[PDB]
Design a protein around this ligand. Structure first.
Ligand SMILES: [Cl-]
Ligand SMILES: [Cl-]
Ligand SMILES: [Gd]
Ligand SMILES: [Gd]
Ligand SMILES: [Gd]
Ligand SMILES: [Gd]
Ligand SMILES: [Gd]
Ligand SMILES: [Gd]
Ligand SMILES: [Gd]
Ligand SMILES: [Gd]
Ligand SMILES: [Gd]
Ligand SMILES: [Gd]
Ligand SMILES: [Gd]
Length: 258
């Protein structure tokens, strides 16, 4: 057969070939999320698109270093220092700092999240960009843990529409990784989703992340088809393009036959 037969029943992930000026990194949009609201982010509709119905706080572009690791302050005898969560104890202190005088349960202001001055204790953010696979094959994306609620979506009409990165979010709830905070209880660690990708195509990528209280954590990784792992720093893999809703050929519904 002169040509590949194509993935079974339109099974391939939709990708894109934007013709515009490529920019290194992801765009991060920040939206309001209420301190101690442990229910809003438990809804699929909210995590897929509803977050953008809340007040948009701001944005930062060109982000390649994408894992989230936010630590609240411990106001201690020696000054004020961020406390790794696993070092917090009692009611409460931080190991190597003694007792902390401040509440774990109030809002805290910090630039920890991509240099944007906001409240990482209570916020929802949206990461958008395109993932560029250097190798053809199966890619396994993972969250090592989720504090508090998160999704990852890959693919045209799943993350967002090709050449329309900056548009309001689409409604698809067909998440690649579903790390939505369960109504009852939590989820295991190392939650994963696999996508088969063709080298040199641009795959829309969306990560929506929310925290309601104190610590926030989202360590992001991908395992390449060659078995190596890229964690946190996605430089060389993630790019942004300004919208071009007029580029007619931008969507590749089936990269296996394109
Ligand atoms: Cl601090
Ligand atoms: Cl201590
Ligand atoms: Gd980082
Ligand atoms: Gd960094
Ligand atoms: Gd770092
Ligand atoms: Gd951090
Ligand atoms: Gd940071
Ligand atoms: Gd840091
Ligand atoms: Gd950092
Ligand atoms: Gd579409
Ligand atoms: Gd949290
Ligand atoms: Gd492996
Ligand atoms: Gd733009």
């Amino acid at each position: 057969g002169l040509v590949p037969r194509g993935s079974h029943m339109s099974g391939a992930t939709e990708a894109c070939l934007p013709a515009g000026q490529r920019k290194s990194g992801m765009n991060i949009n920040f939206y309001q999320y209420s301190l101690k609201d442990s229910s809003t982010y438990s809804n699929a509709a909210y995590m897929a698109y509803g977050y953008a119905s809340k007040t948009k706080l701001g944005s930062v572009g060109g982000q390649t270093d994408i894992s989230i690791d936010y630590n609240i302050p411990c106001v201690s005898s020696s000054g004020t220092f961020p406390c790794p969560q696993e070092d917090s104890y009692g009611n409460w202190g931080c190991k190597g700092m003694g007792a902390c005088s401040n509440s774990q349960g109030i809002a805290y202001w910090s630039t920890d999240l991509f240099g944007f001055y906001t409240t990482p204790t209570n916020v929802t953010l949206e990461m958008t960009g395109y993932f560029l696979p250097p190798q053809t094959g199966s890619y396994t994306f993972s969250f090592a843990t989720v504090d508090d609620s998160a999704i990852l979506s890959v693919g045209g009409s799943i993350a967002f529409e090709c050449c329309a990165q900056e548009q309001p979010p689409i409604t698809s709830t067909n998440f690649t990784i579903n790390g939505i905070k369960p109504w009852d209880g939590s989820l295991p660690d190392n939650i994963t989703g696999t996508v088969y990708m063709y080298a040199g195509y641009y795959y829309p990528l969306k990560v929506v992340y929310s925290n309601a209280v104190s610590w926030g954590t989202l360590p992001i990784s991908v395992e390449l088809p060659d078995g190596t792992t890229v964690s946190d720093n996605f430089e060389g893999y993630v790019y942004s393009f300004d919208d071009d809703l007029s580029q007619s050929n931008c969507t590749i519904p089936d990269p296996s036959i394109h």
